[PDB]
Amino acid sequence: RVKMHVKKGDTVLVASGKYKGRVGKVKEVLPKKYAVIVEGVNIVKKAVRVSPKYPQGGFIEKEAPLHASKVRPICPACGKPTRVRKKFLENGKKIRVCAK
Amino acid sequence: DLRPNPGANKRRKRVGRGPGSGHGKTATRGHKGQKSRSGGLKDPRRFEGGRSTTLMRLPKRGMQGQVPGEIKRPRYQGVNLKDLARFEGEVTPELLVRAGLLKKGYRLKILGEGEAKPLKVVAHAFSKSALEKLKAAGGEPVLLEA
Amino acid sequence: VTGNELVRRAARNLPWVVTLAPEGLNVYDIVRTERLVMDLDAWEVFQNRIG
Amino acid sequence: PKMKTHKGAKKRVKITASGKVVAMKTGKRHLNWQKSGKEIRQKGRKFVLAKPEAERIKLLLPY
RNA sequence: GACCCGGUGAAAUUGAACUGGCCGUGAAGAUGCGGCCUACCCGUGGCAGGACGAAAAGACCCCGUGGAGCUUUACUGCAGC
RNA sequence: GGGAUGACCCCAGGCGGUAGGGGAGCGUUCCCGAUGCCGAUGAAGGCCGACCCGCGAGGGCGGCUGGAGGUAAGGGAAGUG
RNA sequence: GGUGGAGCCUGGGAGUGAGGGCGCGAGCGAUAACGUCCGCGUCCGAGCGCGGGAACAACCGAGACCGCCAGCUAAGGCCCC
RNA sequence: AGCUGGGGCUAGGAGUGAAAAGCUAACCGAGCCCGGAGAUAGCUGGUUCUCCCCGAAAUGACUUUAGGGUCAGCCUCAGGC
RNA sequence: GCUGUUGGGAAGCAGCGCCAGAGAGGGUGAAAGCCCCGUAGGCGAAAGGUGGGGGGAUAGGUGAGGGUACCCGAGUACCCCGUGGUUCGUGGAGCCAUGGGGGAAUCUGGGCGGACCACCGCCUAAGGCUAAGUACUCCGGGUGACCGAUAGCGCACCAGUACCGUGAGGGAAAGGUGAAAAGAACCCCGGGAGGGGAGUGAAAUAGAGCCUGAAACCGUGGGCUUACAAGCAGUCACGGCCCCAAGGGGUUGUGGCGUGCCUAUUGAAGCAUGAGCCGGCGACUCACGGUCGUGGGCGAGCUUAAGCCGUUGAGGCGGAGGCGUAGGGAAACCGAGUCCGAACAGGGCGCGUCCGCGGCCGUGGACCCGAAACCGGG
RNA sequence: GAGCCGGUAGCGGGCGUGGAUCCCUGGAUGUCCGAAUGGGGGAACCCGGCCGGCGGGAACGCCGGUCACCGCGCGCGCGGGGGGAACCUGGGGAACUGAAACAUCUCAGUACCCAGAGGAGAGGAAAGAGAAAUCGACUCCCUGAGUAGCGGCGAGCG
Ligand SMILES: [Mg+2]
Ligand SMILES: [Mg+2]
Ligand SMILES: [Mg+2]
Ligand SMILES: [Mg+2]
Ligand SMILES: [Mg+2]
Ligand SMILES: [Mg+2]
Ligand SMILES: [Mg+2]
Ligand SMILES: [Mg+2]
Ligand SMILES: [Mg+2]
Ligand SMILES: [Mg+2]
Ligand SMILES: [Mg+2]
Ligand SMILES: [Mg+2]
Ligand SMILES: [Mg+2]
Ligand SMILES: [Mg+2]
Ligand SMILES: [Mg+2]
Ligand SMILES: [Mg+2]
Ligand SMILES: [Mg+2]
Ligand SMILES: [Mg+2]
Ligand SMILES: [Mg+2]
Ligand SMILES: [Mg+2]
Ligand SMILES: [Mg+2]
Ligand SMILES: [Mg+2]
Ligand SMILES: [Mg+2]
Ligand SMILES: [Mg+2]
Ligand SMILES: [Mg+2]
Ligand SMILES: [Mg+2]
Ligand SMILES: [Mg+2]
Ligand SMILES: [Mg+2]
Ligand SMILES: [Mg+2]
Ligand SMILES: [Mg+2]
Ligand SMILES: [Mg+2]
Ligand SMILES: [Mg+2]
Ligand SMILES: [Mg+2]
Ligand SMILES: [Mg+2]
Ligand SMILES: [Mg+2]
Ligand SMILES: [Mg+2]
Ligand SMILES: [Mg+2]
Ligand SMILES: [Mg+2]
Ligand SMILES: [Mg+2]
Ligand SMILES: [Mg+2]
Ligand SMILES: [Mg+2]
Ligand SMILES: [Mg+2]
Ligand SMILES: [Mg+2]
Ligand SMILES: [Mg+2]
Ligand SMILES: [Mg+2]
Ligand SMILES: [Mg+2]
Ligand SMILES: [Mg+2]
Ligand SMILES: [Mg+2]
Ligand SMILES: [Mg+2]
Ligand SMILES: [Mg+2]
Ligand SMILES: [Mg+2]
Ligand SMILES: [Mg+2]
Ligand SMILES: [Mg+2]
Ligand SMILES: [Mg+2]
Ligand SMILES: [Mg+2]
Ligand SMILES: [Mg+2]
Ligand SMILES: [Mg+2]
Ligand SMILES: [Mg+2]
Ligand SMILES: [Mg+2]
Ligand SMILES: [Mg+2]
Ligand SMILES: [Mg+2]
Ligand SMILES: [Mg+2]
Ligand SMILES: [Mg+2]
Ligand SMILES: [Mg+2]
Ligand SMILES: [Mg+2]
Ligand SMILES: [Mg+2]
Ligand SMILES: [Mg+2]
Ligand SMILES: [Mg+2]
Ligand SMILES: [Mg+2]
Ligand SMILES: [Mg+2]
Ligand SMILES: [Mg+2]
Ligand SMILES: [Mg+2]
Ligand SMILES: [Mg+2]
Ligand SMILES: [Mg+2]
Ligand SMILES: [Mg+2]
Ligand SMILES: [Mg+2]
Ligand SMILES: [Mg+2]
Ligand SMILES: [Mg+2]
Ligand SMILES: [Mg+2]
Ligand SMILES: [Mg+2]
Ligand SMILES: [Mg+2]
Ligand SMILES: [Mg+2]
Ligand SMILES: [Mg+2]
Ligand SMILES: [Mg+2]
Ligand SMILES: [Mg+2]
Ligand SMILES: [Mg+2]
Ligand SMILES: [Mg+2]
Ligand SMILES: [Mg+2]
Ligand SMILES: [Mg+2]
Ligand SMILES: [Mg+2]
Ligand SMILES: [Mg+2]
Ligand SMILES: [Mg+2]
Ligand SMILES: [Mg+2]
Ligand SMILES: [Mg+2]
Ligand SMILES: [Mg+2]
Ligand SMILES: [Mg+2]
Ligand SMILES: [Mg+2]
Ligand SMILES: [Mg+2]
Ligand SMILES: [Mg+2]
Ligand SMILES: [Mg+2]
Ligand SMILES: [Mg+2]
Ligand SMILES: [Mg+2]
Ligand SMILES: [Mg+2]
Ligand SMILES: [Mg+2]
Ligand SMILES: [Mg+2]
Ligand SMILES: [Mg+2]
Ligand SMILES: [Mg+2]
Ligand SMILES: [Mg+2]
Ligand SMILES: [Mg+2]
Ligand SMILES: [Mg+2]
Ligand SMILES: [Mg+2]
Ligand SMILES: [Mg+2]
Ligand SMILES: [Mg+2]
Ligand SMILES: [Mg+2]
Ligand SMILES: [Mg+2]
Ligand SMILES: [Mg+2]
Ligand SMILES: [Mg+2]
Ligand SMILES: [Mg+2]
Ligand SMILES: [Mg+2]
Ligand SMILES: [Mg+2]
Ligand SMILES: [Mg+2]
Ligand SMILES: [Mg+2]
Ligand SMILES: [Mg+2]
Ligand SMILES: [Mg+2]
Ligand SMILES: [Mg+2]
Ligand SMILES: [Mg+2]
Ligand SMILES: [Mg+2]
Ligand SMILES: [Mg+2]
Ligand SMILES: [Mg+2]
């Protein structure tokens, strides 16, 4: 509904914060909190588990949601918002112009 | 000009005076102070004291209306023939209340004082001095009886 | 103040134009802006509207 | 709302042109009072004073 | 029970109080005003004389052009007859 | 009254105040001014201030606290103290 | 004679219609009451804000715009407090 | 004329009462709850910022009126004289 | 709409741009027209509701004449008695309804035009239907000189809930970590809770019913001060002592002087009333009229109302009407006069609105609180 | 049109660019109570009859239909019954209040109760209005107008 947004599980630039400009991979959309996770915010989760298994070695702990109004998608371009081209039967996301 | 100062020229008097006070209308809620001005008084134009306050007067104004009411009678407005004299032409109703006087009700009784212009008024009643005034300059016809 | 809606559309959307119909002239929308530009077919309706 | 004119004060009080208020003098009233003697002559038409300021505030709209 | 110690620990009341006694005085019954006289600061257990102590916006009286209950050969109705 | 207006400048009086009447103002919320101007080089708010301006209501400035809103001069409407 | 928050008139807004002490003139009372009812005031009311009266609304002195670590005074005092 | 469990009836100017005006969901001379209803209150309480000016009355007439009100007296504001 | 910048973070600042039929708003780590959602504009319905707004047909409608007095709504009209409705309260009481009683005619009928009667009119009762415009707001949407958690609904939250009540019914409080849970791994004390480290984060006196977090209150540390003192708790004066070093503030030792606040009062420190303290909520408004003032407009003119047409927080059209221009009189009526009167004595009375704003008044609940009660339905 | 399996955070369990999750529209199933409606009932439960179905079985069971009552026409069939924040019409209808007491009056045909009805209701085509050789259904809004009037001719209503 309103909950649909920029893009889906592809590679995408983030222009947010500390990671102002970082091309991350496939992004794993959240989106009820309107975020993705993609590759940027990598903050440490100081948690054991809920089920006590394979205990604490190091923390290379996982990512964070990264609110999705700052993940600029990519094509042979940089940024350039998505658009809709329909071609009489489909609905494809073509950027401000390069292609694709 | 701009929205800074077109503002009203120094006289609005709008201290719409709230008596929330301690200085101003000092806390007995200016004018008040005793009791029986505590949320109401009865008139005090017709009213009290409780004596008559004036019913000791007496209705001379008779023929005060049998139950169907005022007979829907003609009522002649009275213009002076000096206030008729502001214009020129065949002065008639609708050179009247179309412009100015007579307030639309029933037809016209010119009367009065002033410089009778020579012009033939089709009025619908006359005072004797108005007739004697404008026959001394002009003429007039009379009412409609159609 | 134009009686041409296809320039009211053009000037509808600026930080410094209050667009206006030729009949909707009013002193508040006059005074809240610093300039006034009106058509001949808005000045004619304004001149015949007022005395 | 729409301040009602006192019909009693209309029926027993006349508002003049310049602002006074006139009524019958009291005591002639079919007499209930006495025999003759020029008081019934002098029951003509007075005008009340400083009671108009409490009385013209009743009769407003049809004078 | 009260009193001491250990535990939990309310209340009505409360203008602030750093709250003595007497003669006066003051809205006419004062810790607070004046004069004097006592009087180190702070408790604990008590007795209750005062703080016009608390409690109940007197329950008696009066006023309300209040309100009810009730009565009747008050007035006027209505039921009923 | 003096004024070669700029009515600032002096002069003679007055200036306790309840109910009240009258005149000036200061504030709070909201709005026009505002698609503006301020504001993370820290907003409203909070704590202070021995400073500043105002007779006062209050307003400024400075210091921390606060971590994101505030809204000028002139005006308007109050759920205004 | 009297230029005074004097008057007269019109209009707006009232408040007030529980007053009290003292003096004088009286009534009622008992030639009693900080009694009650008037008249002429006055003062408190609202001036107890101040001084004296030991204290103390109305007794005596006096009408408090604010300040001053200046002065002269009223009632009252001048041995001390 | 016993007491008591169960099942039931009677309800607001009505029930019920070996009668006290008692009882009727802990306060019954007419239950409680909602609604008219923000009843009414000539009564008591209370009325919220600041400054400046002027400043009363508690009297008369009339009141089913005496703690209230109308008018005049005293007060203020503006205008004219 | 990209870069650089301080920053935790940029959209802030700056440079170089661009769109605009879109510079309404929201969120984005803050301050974004150009990142997102959007908005302007424009598309979209297979299925269902919807709808003459647009055209289609149906059903129905098309004794103009002159006559033989056929029929025109029956316990009805009309009359009386009893009442309700309308402005109508018994009044001069019509009319419209109709509970009782008497009781007709069908067009030379019958009713009405305010007792009634006669002329002149008006109109057809005793059978029924009839869109539209109007009231409403559980509902959906937008709009706010509307509220921002005691406000707004009683409920922003799992609220008509807990709780009270047998019951009808009453009926609460209770929002906010941060950007993101990264919501604290691992130690150490402790049984645990809670801490202290470590870690997160810009910030952890932002650490979990957690933003800001005031005050009352309760502590701890420091300065001054008190155990021969007396007081509505202060104030003025000096003096002593630590803070700043000119002058200050903090303390208070002594002296001088001092009867709290509000209300009600003839008077209150009052041993009259209210107040434990603090924080919030809390009481002169508003609608329509009126009376005076003032700022304006117009000015013997003034002036819109409902409604109509149009918007973007564009307003015009609308003169129906209302005031005002002449008043007297009860009224006919007369008129710069009128009336009382026989009177050409005398005397009584004899010339602006529309807004805004304010004082005040009227009806409104009408400044707010509070009755005992009354009545209806349960 | 790429994520989902509601307010999921956890079992990890699956499911989706051959189209899911969602949203809308149309069906289907809708237990039981409720107008409750087969009868009873102390609502959400009991107890049935007839027909048709499962030693699962003739007895107790369970399933799926149908079984209230009233109104309209020819045993036969189409409606009605209850609910709804207000809005409206009709049947009833107070009292405190105001009159500075109060009874007529006012409050008020208000509140409330009942019935009915619908997106509106009401009313409605003249046995009208009342001064015009006039208007021509009804309703609503503004004027008329606080007028005409009514009125213990008070209060006020209008
Ligand atoms: Mg497709
Ligand atoms: Mg106030
Ligand atoms: Mg009083
Ligand atoms: Mg008094
Ligand atoms: Mg009397
Ligand atoms: Mg533009
Ligand atoms: Mg008129
Ligand atoms: Mg112990
Ligand atoms: Mg007490
Ligand atoms: Mg002591
Ligand atoms: Mg002692
Ligand atoms: Mg004593
Ligand atoms: Mg002593
Ligand atoms: Mg003392
Ligand atoms: Mg004792
Ligand atoms: Mg006691
Ligand atoms: Mg008492
Ligand atoms: Mg009485
Ligand atoms: Mg009784
Ligand atoms: Mg009788
Ligand atoms: Mg003064
Ligand atoms: Mg005053
Ligand atoms: Mg503000
Ligand atoms: Mg800036
Ligand atoms: Mg603010
Ligand atoms: Mg600050
Ligand atoms: Mg500061
Ligand atoms: Mg400002
Ligand atoms: Mg308020
Ligand atoms: Mg308020
Ligand atoms: Mg009196
Ligand atoms: Mg007296
Ligand atoms: Mg005196
Ligand atoms: Mg005395
Ligand atoms: Mg005296
Ligand atoms: Mg004597
Ligand atoms: Mg004496
Ligand atoms: Mg006495
Ligand atoms: Mg005096
Ligand atoms: Mg004095
Ligand atoms: Mg003294
Ligand atoms: Mg003394
Ligand atoms: Mg002085
Ligand atoms: Mg000397
Ligand atoms: Mg001397
Ligand atoms: Mg028994
Ligand atoms: Mg039983
Ligand atoms: Mg009984
Ligand atoms: Mg009992
Ligand atoms: Mg009783
Ligand atoms: Mg009862
Ligand atoms: Mg009440
Ligand atoms: Mg009522
Ligand atoms: Mg009071
Ligand atoms: Mg003075
Ligand atoms: Mg009285
Ligand atoms: Mg007076
Ligand atoms: Mg005077
Ligand atoms: Mg005056
Ligand atoms: Mg920074
Ligand atoms: Mg924003
Ligand atoms: Mg922030
Ligand atoms: Mg933005
Ligand atoms: Mg569009
Ligand atoms: Mg279709
Ligand atoms: Mg179709
Ligand atoms: Mg339809
Ligand atoms: Mg017929
Ligand atoms: Mg018969
Ligand atoms: Mg008849
Ligand atoms: Mg009559
Ligand atoms: Mg005939
Ligand atoms: Mg007839
Ligand atoms: Mg007729
Ligand atoms: Mg007739
Ligand atoms: Mg007639
Ligand atoms: Mg219809
Ligand atoms: Mg309509
Ligand atoms: Mg919404
Ligand atoms: Mg707000
Ligand atoms: Mg808001
Ligand atoms: Mg809250
Ligand atoms: Mg709330
Ligand atoms: Mg809060
Ligand atoms: Mg809830
Ligand atoms: Mg219970
Ligand atoms: Mg956040
Ligand atoms: Mg722990
Ligand atoms: Mg806390
Ligand atoms: Mg906090
Ligand atoms: Mg200490
Ligand atoms: Mg000693
Ligand atoms: Mg010592
Ligand atoms: Mg002392
Ligand atoms: Mg001292
Ligand atoms: Mg002293
Ligand atoms: Mg004092
Ligand atoms: Mg007094
Ligand atoms: Mg006394
Ligand atoms: Mg006290
Ligand atoms: Mg005491
Ligand atoms: Mg007491
Ligand atoms: Mg008292
Ligand atoms: Mg003008
Ligand atoms: Mg049009
Ligand atoms: Mg004359
Ligand atoms: Mg006004
Ligand atoms: Mg009654
Ligand atoms: Mg789930
Ligand atoms: Mg599908
Ligand atoms: Mg599917
Ligand atoms: Mg689904
Ligand atoms: Mg099935
Ligand atoms: Mg059943
Ligand atoms: Mg049954
Ligand atoms: Mg059962
Ligand atoms: Mg088988
Ligand atoms: Mg078988
Ligand atoms: Mg069956
Ligand atoms: Mg059919
Ligand atoms: Mg029904
Ligand atoms: Mg009554
Ligand atoms: Mg009454
Ligand atoms: Mg009475
Ligand atoms: Mg009525
Ligand atoms: Mg209809
Ligand atoms: Mg009908
Ligand atoms: Mg017809
Ligand atoms: Mg009408």
XYZ file of N, CA, C and O (backbone and C1' of nucleotides) in Angstrom, chain B residues 9 12-14 16-17 29 31-32 39 42-43 60 62 66-68 73 77 80 83 86 101-103 109 111-113 127-129, chain I residues 87-88 92-93 114 284 294-296 301 320-321 323-326 330-332 334-336 356-363 366-368:
359
model
N -6.365 53.059 13.709
C -5.709 54.318 14.060
C -6.041 54.719 15.491
O -6.878 55.582 15.758
N -9.400 51.799 19.211
C -10.292 50.659 19.291
C -10.877 50.440 20.670
O -11.889 49.746 20.782
N -10.225 50.953 21.715
C -10.608 50.870 23.125
C -10.729 49.434 23.601
O -11.331 49.178 24.646
N -10.136 48.478 22.896
C -10.372 47.080 23.227
C -9.388 46.610 24.290
O -8.524 45.762 24.085
N -10.978 44.758 26.474
C -12.274 44.149 26.686
C -12.271 43.566 28.074
O -12.132 42.355 28.246
N -12.468 44.441 29.060
C -11.738 44.455 30.325
C -12.009 43.213 31.156
O -13.037 43.097 31.821
N -14.958 41.665 41.417
C -15.522 41.645 40.077
C -16.205 42.948 39.791
O -17.408 43.042 40.031
N -17.765 46.656 38.793
C -18.910 46.726 39.678
C -19.636 45.429 40.000
O -20.181 44.759 39.123
N -19.621 45.114 41.289
C -20.422 44.165 42.060
C -20.046 44.446 43.515
O -19.409 45.461 43.808
N -25.102 36.533 39.522
C -25.560 35.644 38.483
C -26.907 36.002 37.930
O -27.502 35.188 37.226
N -33.464 40.841 37.856
C -34.663 40.460 37.109
C -34.946 41.332 35.884
O -34.834 40.829 34.761
N -35.358 42.619 36.024
C -35.123 43.302 34.754
C -33.891 44.210 34.682
O -32.951 43.820 33.997
N -54.463 54.962 27.914
C -55.236 55.826 27.030
C -55.191 55.337 25.607
O -56.139 55.562 24.850
N -56.168 53.579 23.283
C -57.305 52.733 23.065
C -57.421 52.363 21.616
O -56.589 52.722 20.783
N -58.897 44.553 18.712
C -59.675 43.322 18.660
C -58.907 42.175 18.006
O -58.016 42.403 17.185
N -59.290 40.942 18.322
C -58.439 39.764 18.140
C -57.999 39.438 16.707
O -56.937 38.817 16.572
N -58.668 39.814 15.605
C -57.984 39.601 14.327
C -56.873 40.596 14.095
O -55.876 40.245 13.458
N -55.231 48.772 6.583
C -55.715 50.035 6.076
C -54.639 50.751 5.279
O -53.453 50.437 5.400
N -47.691 58.085 3.510
C -46.446 58.721 3.889
C -46.496 60.193 3.526
O -47.133 60.594 2.553
N -42.388 66.408 2.468
C -42.581 67.817 2.239
C -42.456 68.082 0.755
O -41.812 67.337 0.015
N -38.698 68.594 0.114
C -37.916 67.399 -0.142
C -38.384 66.687 -1.390
O -37.683 65.812 -1.898
N -36.150 68.255 -4.697
C -34.753 67.985 -4.963
C -34.508 67.600 -6.412
O -33.364 67.668 -6.868
N -37.695 58.397 -0.998
C -38.569 58.529 0.158
C -39.668 57.466 0.121
O -39.503 56.420 -0.500
N -40.715 57.661 0.922
C -42.041 57.045 0.838
C -42.138 55.576 1.279
O -43.232 55.129 1.635
N -41.001 54.892 1.414
C -40.842 53.498 1.896
C -41.955 52.503 1.496
O -42.478 51.751 2.320
N -48.926 61.402 0.314
C -49.539 62.662 0.711
C -48.415 63.675 0.814
O -47.722 63.720 1.830
N -47.009 67.396 1.455
C -47.449 68.399 2.398
C -46.347 69.426 2.557
O -45.397 69.479 1.771
N -46.487 70.260 3.561
C -45.326 70.876 4.135
C -44.980 72.243 3.600
O -45.760 72.958 2.970
N -43.744 72.599 3.887
C -43.198 73.915 3.661
C -42.130 73.829 2.590
O -41.722 72.745 2.175
N -52.045 68.142 1.441
C -52.513 69.077 2.439
C -52.926 70.354 1.739
O -52.457 70.660 0.638
N -53.819 71.097 2.396
C -54.385 72.302 1.802
C -53.313 73.351 1.569
O -53.323 74.047 0.546
N -52.344 73.437 2.472
C -51.256 74.374 2.256
C -50.298 73.903 1.180
O -49.658 74.736 0.540
P -49.217 30.532 16.165
O -50.044 31.487 17.117
C -49.396 32.119 18.199
C -50.107 33.371 18.611
C -51.527 33.196 19.087
O -51.580 32.780 20.437
C -51.399 35.015 17.595
P -51.909 31.259 20.817
O -53.387 31.328 21.380
C -53.746 32.317 22.322
C -55.168 32.777 22.139
C -56.202 31.708 21.869
O -56.593 31.087 23.077
C -56.566 33.585 20.467
P -67.705 39.101 24.903
O -67.841 39.308 23.336
C -69.071 39.083 22.668
C -68.889 39.196 21.182
C -68.157 38.043 20.528
O -69.062 37.033 20.143
C -67.213 40.096 19.837
P -68.848 35.519 20.595
O -67.774 34.976 19.568
C -68.190 34.198 18.457
C -67.056 33.396 17.881
C -66.685 32.134 18.645
O -66.184 31.161 17.734
C -64.859 33.624 18.637
P -63.262 37.896 8.031
O -63.387 36.636 8.978
C -64.666 36.212 9.416
C -64.828 36.339 10.903
C -64.858 37.755 11.447
O -65.717 37.789 12.572
C -63.078 36.579 12.425
P -14.100 34.997 34.071
O -15.094 36.055 33.438
C -15.761 35.764 32.222
C -16.560 36.935 31.722
C -15.781 38.234 31.577
O -15.937 38.870 30.294
C -17.593 38.509 33.114
P -18.214 60.323 20.824
O -16.977 59.524 20.247
C -15.785 59.419 20.999
C -14.954 58.258 20.534
C -14.683 58.201 19.045
O -13.616 59.034 18.638
C -15.408 56.093 19.788
P -13.549 59.569 17.126
O -12.981 58.334 16.313
C -11.678 57.844 16.563
C -11.350 56.730 15.616
C -11.705 57.004 14.176
O -10.667 57.701 13.530
C -12.541 54.898 14.800
P -10.989 58.687 12.320
O -11.263 57.702 11.120
C -12.557 57.632 10.574
C -12.747 56.375 9.787
C -13.722 56.516 8.644
O -13.110 57.029 7.484
C -14.349 54.689 9.949
P -30.634 62.418 -1.023
O -30.494 60.837 -1.156
C -29.231 60.188 -1.090
C -28.757 60.031 0.337
C -28.214 58.674 0.750
O -26.887 58.430 0.330
C -29.716 59.413 2.381
P -36.877 46.090 -4.381
O -37.609 44.899 -3.653
C -36.855 43.992 -2.883
C -37.752 43.124 -2.063
C -38.308 43.750 -0.802
O -39.471 44.519 -1.058
C -37.532 41.551 -0.373
P -39.873 45.796 -0.164
O -39.235 45.525 1.255
C -40.003 45.002 2.318
C -39.089 44.528 3.403
C -38.684 45.592 4.388
O -39.643 45.752 5.406
C -36.765 44.461 3.639
P -38.392 49.243 10.840
O -37.629 50.398 11.602
C -37.086 51.482 10.881
C -35.630 51.698 11.184
C -35.242 53.155 11.211
O -35.485 53.784 12.449
C -33.839 52.069 9.702
P -36.495 55.021 12.497
O -35.853 56.093 11.516
C -34.600 56.679 11.813
C -34.124 57.575 10.705
C -35.063 58.687 10.324
O -35.041 59.762 11.233
C -34.252 57.661 8.377
P -36.261 60.794 11.259
O -35.857 61.835 10.136
C -36.826 62.330 9.245
C -36.258 62.570 7.879
C -37.133 63.390 6.961
O -37.112 64.773 7.226
C -36.413 61.472 5.820
P -38.487 65.512 7.597
O -38.984 64.831 8.952
C -40.049 63.884 8.946
C -40.869 63.924 10.197
C -42.002 62.919 10.184
O -42.521 62.793 11.505
C -42.884 65.061 9.941
P -54.297 60.099 22.326
O -54.000 58.961 21.275
C -53.687 57.661 21.704
C -54.753 56.699 21.270
C -55.073 56.681 19.792
O -54.184 55.824 19.105
C -57.064 56.632 21.092
P -53.626 56.195 17.658
O -54.919 56.152 16.744
C -55.467 54.916 16.330
C -56.832 55.110 15.742
C -56.906 56.017 14.536
O -56.585 55.347 13.334
C -58.594 56.603 16.070
P -56.097 56.176 12.057
O -57.434 56.777 11.447
C -58.430 55.931 10.911
C -59.745 56.646 10.755
C -59.774 57.778 9.756
O -59.985 57.315 8.436
C -60.840 58.442 11.761
P -57.788 63.983 5.885
O -56.970 65.164 6.558
C -57.659 66.239 7.171
C -56.791 66.944 8.167
C -55.474 67.474 7.648
O -55.584 68.688 6.940
C -55.101 66.309 9.652
P -54.604 68.978 5.708
O -53.155 69.054 6.345
C -52.717 70.238 6.981
C -51.489 69.983 7.808
C -50.165 69.985 7.068
O -49.647 71.295 6.972
C -50.295 68.129 8.550
P -48.519 71.661 5.903
O -47.164 71.612 6.719
C -46.549 72.826 7.128
C -46.811 73.085 8.583
C -46.156 74.320 9.176
O -46.988 74.811 10.222
C -45.359 72.407 10.280
P -19.971 44.652 13.130
O -18.511 44.902 13.668
C -17.423 44.634 12.816
C -16.243 45.465 13.186
C -16.029 45.607 14.663
O -15.427 44.464 15.218
C -15.798 47.695 13.643
P -16.073 43.781 16.507
O -15.483 44.657 17.681
C -14.109 44.980 17.687
C -13.856 46.179 18.537
C -14.574 46.180 19.857
O -13.973 45.326 20.801
C -14.725 48.309 18.873
P -14.876 44.493 21.818
O -15.165 45.543 22.961
C -14.077 46.161 23.601
C -14.470 47.417 24.309
C -15.595 47.312 25.302
O -15.225 46.705 26.512
C -15.918 49.206 23.989
P -16.258 45.721 27.226
O -17.147 46.701 28.098
C -16.528 47.668 28.919
C -17.510 48.663 29.467
C -18.834 48.114 29.936
O -18.749 47.535 31.221
C -19.177 50.089 28.704
P -19.543 46.187 31.558
O -21.062 46.611 31.451
C -21.613 47.511 32.386
C -22.952 47.994 31.931
C -23.959 46.909 31.663
O -24.561 46.449 32.849
C -23.983 48.469 29.900
P -25.012 44.924 32.973
O -26.459 44.930 32.332
C -27.442 45.833 32.799
C -28.557 45.976 31.803
C -29.201 44.685 31.343
O -30.103 44.100 32.262
C -28.724 46.005 29.468
P -30.212 42.502 32.312
O -31.221 42.176 31.138
C -32.455 42.852 31.053
C -33.179 42.493 29.803
C -33.226 41.018 29.511
O -34.270 40.389 30.212
C -32.552 42.177 27.594
P -33.951 39.184 31.209
O -34.218 37.919 30.303
C -35.381 37.895 29.503
C -35.196 37.040 28.286
C -34.433 35.761 28.513
O -35.200 34.753 29.124
C -33.608 36.817 26.592
P -28.389 32.199 34.733
O -27.372 33.170 34.012
C -26.161 33.512 34.657
C -25.219 34.258 33.758
C -25.666 35.649 33.335
O -24.524 36.494 33.234
C -25.287 34.332 31.434
P -23.985 37.280 34.526
O -22.702 36.461 34.950
C -21.901 35.846 33.967
C -20.769 35.078 34.586
C -21.132 33.890 35.446
O -21.443 32.744 34.690
C -19.466 35.152 36.503
P -22.260 31.532 35.331
O -21.181 30.736 36.162
C -20.064 30.158 35.522
C -19.052 29.682 36.527
C -19.565 28.638 37.471
O -19.569 27.372 36.874
C -18.399 30.259 38.690
